[PDB]
Amino acid sequence: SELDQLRQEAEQLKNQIRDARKACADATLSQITNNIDPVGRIQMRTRRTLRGHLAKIYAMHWGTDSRLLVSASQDGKLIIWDSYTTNKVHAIPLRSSWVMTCAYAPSGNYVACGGLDNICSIYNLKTREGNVRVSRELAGHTGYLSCCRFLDDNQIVTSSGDTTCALWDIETGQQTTTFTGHTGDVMSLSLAPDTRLFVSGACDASAKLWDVREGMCRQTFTGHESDINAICFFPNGNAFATGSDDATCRLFDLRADQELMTYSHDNIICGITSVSFSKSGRLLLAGYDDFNCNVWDALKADRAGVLAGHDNRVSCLGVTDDGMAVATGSWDSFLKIWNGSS
Amino acid sequence: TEDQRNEEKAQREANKMIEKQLQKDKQVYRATHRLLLLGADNSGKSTIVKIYHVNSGIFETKFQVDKVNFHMFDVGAQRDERRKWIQCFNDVTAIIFVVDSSDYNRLQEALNDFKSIWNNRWLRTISVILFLNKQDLLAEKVLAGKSKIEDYFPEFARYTTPEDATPEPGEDPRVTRAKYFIRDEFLRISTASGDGRHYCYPHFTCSVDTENARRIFNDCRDIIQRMHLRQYELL
């Protein structure tokens, strides 16, 4: 009988939160940004095409120098590209070919990856032997690894399909903090610019804000109607955007603790795989199942442009730290680099 | 810029070494055919093929038929929700689906599993090799008469054996009447969608059946050949 009692108290708390969010919803982001001029039409050309992967690409991550990037393919190889020259700097053969995520360390000395093997493998790029070797295998997750992001050379946060996120100490190989509370598979995570907080999106159609040091969920964001596949912090750290299978993108605010804007179109009926922001945050780039990448106006919810250069699913995309270019990865095994021209 | 000039040459020379290794790996990657093994726990999917390795939480089975390498993957260490990691196998040659024919209670669940996998948006172009395992148990259950299939499937009351059926010699007509009924349940889902992009290959197999490796080879040969006719129309 106590379970029924707690079920009703939860509804009262949910109504209290919903009323609190409605109380501070005095205006709409659309009304605030109505006066500003639109960004116009955004035209981007494919400057580079990265060829070499034999299987569908599942993840990519830029290095902090805005020149090197690492891309993970499903054939079992990790390749590091020099985007300026399209030269391959490294090719790391993976023990398990079913990799789903990859991360580039901010120092540039390490890369991470992992997939259906439930392991986050750390690879040392700067060895005296001249070859890339596995330095750490982070075991402990009971589901597939969906996303991973370095905090520094010694700390990394991983999200798994066992509904939990973990913070790992690479030197000791143990997970210092475990982030629990999602009821579905966590598909993505994004780090705040100060690396004190991170948001994660799961298959329960909810986004949770986690405190890295404290290790608990600070805020929960709802609004999506299907599994969340992508998430990305706003450049100032006070907001984030998500992408779900319901063909919508939503902009949530941390301080207002509610959704601010929805980015959807009637023609779009396919799921969203990846999201990222431009350096100023004015543009939101989202990848879709229809082989296209739509550039949205974050403030005005206008489709600024379309990146149509892939013949299969766009699985990932990312914008460089300096904002100079955007790379898009796809299931057709190719990577493309995009930027505009004057 | 003389110092910088040779730096690009060194990076370009390292690129060629990587490209040479990628070509060697490309030959091995395309010479191996990857299969996804599916089925419930009661199904004997782990013993379908008579080199077995366990890599992380994935059970890898590698066998060679007529100098062709097949790499069959079984996913064990995952939760019951599989609508996300099933997309990792969207480029496999075929899906191996194993069903316990004698298990009438869980037979409807196997149909629902087949229906979702068949109609998955990322699996619309992948053929399925269907193994209706444990036929000897099905024969005993029908002959005993303790359990009636019509109790679980009302359509069995007014079902007739197909004219194209090829029952084994010395087989009870009741057994082959019900043996082909379960097969048509999976073929009804198969033939109601797909639009020709993929087909289903039903087989009758038992626990002591060493020909299942050959059957996969023959079916994947027809899958690849049908794939070639579609994507190599313009040579």
Epitope: T183, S226, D245 | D80, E81, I117, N120
Partner: nanobody, 128 residues
Framework: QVQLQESGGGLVQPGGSLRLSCAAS????????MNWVRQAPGKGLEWVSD????????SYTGSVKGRFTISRDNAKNTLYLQMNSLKPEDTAVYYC?????????????????????RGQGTQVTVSS
Amino acid sequence: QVQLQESGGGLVQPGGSLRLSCAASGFTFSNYKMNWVRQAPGKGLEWVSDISQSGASISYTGSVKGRFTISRDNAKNTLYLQMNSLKPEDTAVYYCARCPAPFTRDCFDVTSTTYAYRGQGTQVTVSS
């Protein structure tokens, strides 16, 4: 927030009739295929029936075929399950399950142990 509220049910004598109602909120009800899932005591969850987005396609489990009728009201955002000629083997907790993605023919994980888009469930008892 996606939420489903199952209403109806209770204690009914064998051979009686019972109607279940599922109230949908937090999503566009007309864009999703809906399912009915039950869990008998001592047994796992099993799929009972599903109805397509427009109601054109309808399926049932063979154990309940000819006795259960499933209908949906997109305008009312409500799902119904008419259960007549009930049997003591139908005593179970009935769940209203939504397919994970819109505009799809597949429905993968509705009959799973921990499914996010499934309601709390309603108790149906048929034993006299």
